[PDB]
Design brief:
Chain A: GO terms for molecular function: GTP binding; GTPase activity; ribonucleoprotein complex binding; U3 snoRNA binding. This is part of a larger assembly, with chains A, B, C and D. Helix content of chain A is about 20%, strand content about 30%. Chain A contains eleven helices and 30 strands. Chain A is globular, with a radius of gyration of 33 Å. Chain A is α+β, with helices and mostly antiparallel strands. By secondary structure, chain B is mostly helical. Chain B has one domain. Chain B is about 25% helix and about 0% strand. Chain D is an all-alpha fold. Chain D starts with a helix and ends in a 19-residue tail after the last helix. The chains are: A alpha+beta, B mainly alpha, C mainly beta, D mainly alpha. Chains in contact: A-B, A-C, C-D. At the C-D interface, loops of C face helix 1 of D. The structure holds one RNA strand.
Amino acid sequence: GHKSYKSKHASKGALKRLYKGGKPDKQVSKLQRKNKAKQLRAQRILDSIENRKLFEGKNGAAKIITIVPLVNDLDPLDILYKLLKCADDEGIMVQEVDSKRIFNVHIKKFKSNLKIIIPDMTNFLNILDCAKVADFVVFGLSGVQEVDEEFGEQIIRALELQGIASYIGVISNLSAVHEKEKFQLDVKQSLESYFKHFFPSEERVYNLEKNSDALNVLRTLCQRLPRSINWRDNRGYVVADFVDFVETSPDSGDLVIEGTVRGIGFNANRLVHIPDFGDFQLNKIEKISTVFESNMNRDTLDEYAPEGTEDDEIELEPSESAIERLKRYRGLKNLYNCDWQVDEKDPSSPAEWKRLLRIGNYKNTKNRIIKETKNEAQAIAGDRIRMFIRFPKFLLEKIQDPKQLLFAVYGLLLHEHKNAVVNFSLQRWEQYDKPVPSQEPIVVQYGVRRYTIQPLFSQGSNSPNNVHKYERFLHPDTVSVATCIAPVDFTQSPAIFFKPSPTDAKNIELIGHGTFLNADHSRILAKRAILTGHPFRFHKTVVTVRYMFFRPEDVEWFKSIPLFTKSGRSGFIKESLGTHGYFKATFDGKLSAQDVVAMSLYKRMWPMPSLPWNG
Amino acid sequence: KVHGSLARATEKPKKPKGRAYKRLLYTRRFVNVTLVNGKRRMNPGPS
Amino acid sequence: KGIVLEKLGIESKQPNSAIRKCVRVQLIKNGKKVTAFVPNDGCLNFVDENDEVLLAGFGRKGKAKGDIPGVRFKVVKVSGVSLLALWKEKKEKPRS
Amino acid sequence: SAKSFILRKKELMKRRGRKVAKDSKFTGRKRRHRF
RNA sequence: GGAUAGUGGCCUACCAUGGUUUCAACGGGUAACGGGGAAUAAGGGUUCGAUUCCGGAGAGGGAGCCUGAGAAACGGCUACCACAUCCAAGGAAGGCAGCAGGCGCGCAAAUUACCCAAUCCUAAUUCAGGGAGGUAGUGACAAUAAAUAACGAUACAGGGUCUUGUAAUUGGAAUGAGUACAAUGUAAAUACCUUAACGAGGAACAAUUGGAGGGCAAGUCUGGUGCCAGCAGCCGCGGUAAUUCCAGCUCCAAUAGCGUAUAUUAAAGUUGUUGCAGUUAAAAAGCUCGUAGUUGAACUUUGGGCCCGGUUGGCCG
């Protein structure tokens, strides 16, 4: 070859072989630089004030505060009364000493409004329910007794994974340890490192003995902005203060909920969920600080959408017939090199599978459903709404006084009540060595809805064919995927997995936790089926297998499927020798009597529908 | 796994630490060298 | 420090995988969006959406131990805890 | 292709004449699972 | 001439047409207060200096002024602008870049503590006052010193009658981390220094952070998971653009410290004055003239003689 021409910038002749095949520049002067930094900061400081417009606690504000002590030898009443002592107001504690659990505390020192909520200690779900509504959780600790091993830490971890807002840790029992301050500091740092293990953001747990540090807590609740939770703030939520039932029909009426609205915003056409009550539809809303009613675009209350109708070794038993049990199977060879269809006809498939929504992509409609509720919301978050809801009559025996137990109201998005087959992420809880199957009834709290479920366990390894292997038992180490039918959640809200048992102090046996992954019907879970047999007799080329079958018709029909062994040797059958399952076969190598003759054959599973849980 | 609330007030016995650990290296490295192959290997497997 | 938006499947190859994939994160001060790098798998369950991670430069690279082109911002902390301590089971990450 | 690179340069220093350790089944592994 | 404490275009009236600049004027940028100084070390240098001392300026932005020796003062006033507070709706009060503190910002920074005992300052003055300052709390910014064991006996392995290692072998000594009478300490306390009493037999009173093709110090290690149209077929072996997929063992370095990220310095002679390079690797204007700039041949009391008083070594002591 020839030595090439060389230049740093390409020659004009060479550009002709290549090419043939405005805003002027600015040099920033100081005043333009000084003005731009002023304009961006002034826009920033308006952003901070307007985002803080929710909490000028004189008329239009309510910070929801829940005192959650962790020790049975710890009363939230004295924790509350120590903090209110630093507001220089004694009459406020007198009015609430008799019997109150919901407090509308107005603070004149810091010009703030607090809503104080104390949950009931006898119910673990009630403690879980009162805390997700709040914007602040105050964890009361002990200086005298250690935290409960199976009760106290379980409260922290249950709140840890379902979503939690900002937090402050306090101590009220520090007087019980020795009075020398060198001893009070030695136990205080022990709790400081203990709370840092659970909640790493705060490296100081507060002592309520010092009135400045008692004010340090009291200021921080009123002043510092609450950290937001994505799933709660994407659907809106209402805390009730007054509930009144009216009569309009012999079987149902209207509840008059007088409460404040926070979150994203509410619409007259959308549904609603009340915890441990169910899902209902809207009737009328009213604004006090216009009137909006549910028009003809109501979402109907039905669990199945009616408009979707138009769109591993197993020992064989001699009495059990190998023909009837093995008709819905396919004889593929590789899990990653096979094909399946989602619309196959099967008696084991549910009849209501045709009545199921076939959602295309999750994240696109998840992004779509947020911006619709942003603009189509009537009740703006940060207002007072008189809420008129539709309500069946026979549930009035369960609703209690809202001033003693919390009564939340949760907004819903589009097509929440309609089902779609979904898959959940699942990680095993700490110190849980009990193995569970893939059909046990499990109660799951995801988002706000609580449902009974028996999902199908699987592995989360990626596959081009979207087919995965089934596990009979839950995998003890890594994350698993549980696929089932449930009402869809468009917020990717976290999920917690448990089962009730009255043996514990709580009626909860925590199994694990996880996240709402997807509403996926393309993902199909398959199971490998192995039936075993003992090779009875051996010849130079013919092997006789015993306890593989028990009828001669089973041998003849199963001739096409290629034969293999667990040692990794393939082969084929030759003829049926006996009636009780003795048959001839041929193999590439010579196998002994400790080897097992096995088959590889595959099927489908169809999961079971969900049911809401109460009690 | 979790730290105890009141904690702050196979198994092989522990190596010495600090000055006494350097005594272990000086004995191990070169006084009475254990394995000799002519090039003074330092970490063999199954010989 | 920046807000994570979504997580990408920037994978080594298709299914037979050396799993090193990471997220798309917007810095909070200048508002610019960058591509991040998370360590080995098992830390992707920690990083959900909108976690406010604290991320630092990646910088040095060899011809092994991470050769992904177009990423220079490893994620050091998620939700204000860590990723070293959170992976080695020292602490726990609060959920939003 | 990390194992292909580590072997490729290793016999090159046979021809250059320098010491290099003889190998085993850790040659192309991540010696440290990361943070 | 006016004005000032006072010189002076400082201002005014008139009259001249000057003054700076390629030796970079003027304009622009500075994420620029200047300096003593800081890091980096073979030299010269490169980078930094908001910050314990000196000097300048500002008290949300401008301007104006009272009092006084001194102020264009803001813990003084007045007006305007921008924020913002109270209410009886007529009006009043503002300025934490002082000390604590809080919001906002961000990767990024502590107690709404004790006292004038010290250092000094102010006053009518030994006496009052001082968030000036000091004491203490938070504080792995940075720096100094060095705990986590030492000795003996028995049995084996050695070098070989005297010297080492090994052991679920054994024995008593010594001590502070701690708790704490008391005393010192301090304005009063905490803490240090001293000390009656208690306080070590290993899962006690248990050290971590990184690293193993080279750099480079440290493996002819192990187990498990997934794939192979690869050999063999009781087992296995090998590959595995699984850039090792997940764990463990062993070894090495530093050590109450250690790693990562960004910036900068050395390595670096990749800024080259010391000290780079331009035929072919980045780079000698197409060629010559020519102002500033830089550089510019040799040459004019050289040599000899006289004495004088010194600082160094010695033959000498």
